Every structure is written in C-alpha cells, then in structure tokens.
C-alpha cells in the first residue's frame, strides 16, 4: 500500500487530521508525531481527493505521498 505524511502541523491539527482521515478511509500504522502525522493508506481512496479534503485545514505542500 501507500504512505501519507503530514508536516508542520499546529496544536490540535494532528488529532483533527487523524479524524478527518478517518471519515475518508481506514488507516493502519498511524504515527502521531508532535507536529507530524504519517500512515499507511489501503488504496481504496484516490490521493487527490485526500489532498482536497485536508486542504480545508492545511496547505498542499504539507502533504506528501510515497510507496512503502
């Protein structure tokens, strides 16, 4: 599967973005850093859709996708 990485998050944004990711897919191997959040994405949701959703909160440059 693929890997999502979220950077430079402000206070609260890690939980907020974890939940937001919840509404859209089932996350595994979730890693909650102090101002970062990473996880393994099943693949059942198009990446572009994710970016569009998280952008309700953060900026695109704070989102990265890569193979595991």
């Amino acid at each position: 599967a693929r890997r999502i990485i979220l950077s430079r998050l402000k206070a609260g944004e890690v939980d907020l973005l974890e939940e937001e990711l919840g509404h859209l897919t089932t996350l595994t191997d979730v890693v909650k850093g102090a101002d970062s959040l990473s996880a393994i994405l099943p693949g059942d949701i198009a990446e572009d859709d994710i970016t569009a959703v998280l952008c309700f909160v953060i900026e695109a440059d704070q989102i990265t996708f890569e193979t595991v």
Binding site: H23, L24, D49, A52, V53, C55, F56
Partner: protein, 128 residues
C-alpha cells in the same frame, strides 16, 4: 475580517436559517440576508456585494453542491467563500464538497465556537 461583511445564509428550513443568523450575530456579524434554496440564492447573489455564503446540503430545486458549482463557475463571484453545512461527515459528500471548490464544510448541529473556527480558517486562508 470586516464585521460589516455581507453574509448569505441558504437553507430550506427557516429555523436553521434563523439559528445560523443568530450565531453570526453572536460573532459580531449583522449584515446577513437569507435564501431558501440554490435557485433563490443565485438570484440574490446577482445583487452583488456579498462577501460570504453559508449553505446547507439538502434543498429542493437546487441543492448545495449545485449552488457551490454554479458559484465557482461564475467568473464574477467565482472566488466567493462558501461554507457547506451538512448533517453527517459522510465520506462521499466531503470529497464532493472539496472537489467542487467549497471553502470548507461543517456538520450540524454545530456550535458558535465551531462556526468561529470555521470562519477564521477561511478568513486566514484567503487573507481576510
């Protein structure tokens, strides 16, 4: 954000329309007009001078997604901030909102603090 910014609250139920208006007033926003559906909203937007649209999802004649889409494709109000009000954080609905160009979405019933958070994120995001 300028407190006399003009809001347009769109919902087919008059009670929700009033709730949202009172909430905007609790936040210091008093320049607010209401609309009953997508069609009614587009018609009112024509008057111009609107700085913010808060719209519900479910409405007859024209629902919220369609109102949003029409706003975005309209070269004269294309960048108008639009907050979608939905009754459920539903996966398929949130994507549609995101791709359609919504400035954000909020699940009802919502609080005044939630609305403020929503407004500020949008103001901040657009340098308002």
């Amino acid at each position: 954000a300028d407190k006399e910014l003009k809001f347009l609250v769109v919902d087919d139920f008059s009670t929700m329309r009033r709730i949202v208006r009172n909430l905007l007033k609790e936040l210091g926003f008093n320049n607010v007009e209401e609309a009953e559906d997508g069609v009614d909203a587009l018609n009112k937007l024509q008057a111009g001078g609107y700085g913010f649209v808060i719209s519900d999802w479910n409405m007859p004649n024209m629902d919220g997604l369609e109102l949003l889409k029409t706003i975005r494709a309209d070269g004269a109000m294309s960048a108008l901030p639009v907050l979608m009000v939905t009754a459920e954080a539903k996966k398929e609905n949130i994507i549609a909102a995101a791709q359609a160009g919504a400035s954000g979405y909020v699940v009802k019933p919502f609080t005044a603090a939630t609305l403020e958070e929503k407004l500020n994120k949008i103001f901040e995001k657009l340098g308002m």
